[model samples]
Target: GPMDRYQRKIGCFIQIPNLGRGQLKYVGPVDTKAGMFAGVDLLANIGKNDGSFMGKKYFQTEYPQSGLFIQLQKVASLIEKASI
Candidate 1:
């Protein structure tokens, strides 16, 4: 099995596909989704929601539709890629 274990933290910046760079808002299990989820507050719009899952808000963003949730493994730390 091949996997990249990224060290995700709530204040760190992460690189998300299509969404570009965003701040890690929350990192843990979301009530509506299975497995570990990474809540990201994107710098721009392209996100699905403002960190709301099934009506409950997990996190907040500056703008509407600027928050996105994804599996933890799919996100990459900005510093992780910069070091390489």
Candidate 2:
């Protein structure tokens, strides 16, 4: 879909607004055939969603899910990785 690491991967502590922090589980197309953006899987008070989206693809999460696919225009590196 797009380009990212944290919200595009399968595990991490991501900062969320109003909520707290959600862990990024799987980041991919909401749909395998028509998604135009990226999706993110999360957990805990880390975040929340509608399980709804406006793209060819959306994020997928666990049972009794909430959040949906999110498009990232810019993701600030709050944590340190090896560095891209």
lDDT of 2 by residue, 10-64 (tens): 4555554554455454444454444333333455323345345444224455633
Q: lDDT for every model?
A: 0.71, 0.43
The prediction achieving the highest TM-score against the true structure is 1
lDDT of 2: 0.43
TM-score of 2: 0.43
Question: For candidate 1, lDDT tens digit of each residue in 1-84?
Answer: 122334335667766666688887876778856877778889677888888888888899878989988886676444355332
What is the C-alpha local distance difference test score of candidate 1? Answer: 0.71
Predictions: Cα RMSD each: 4.3, 5.7
| Model 1 alpha-carbon drift over 4 Å, by segment | 1-8, 76-84
Name model 2 segments beyond 4 Å from true.
1-9, 32-38, 41-60, 74-84
State the RMSD for candidate 2.
5.7
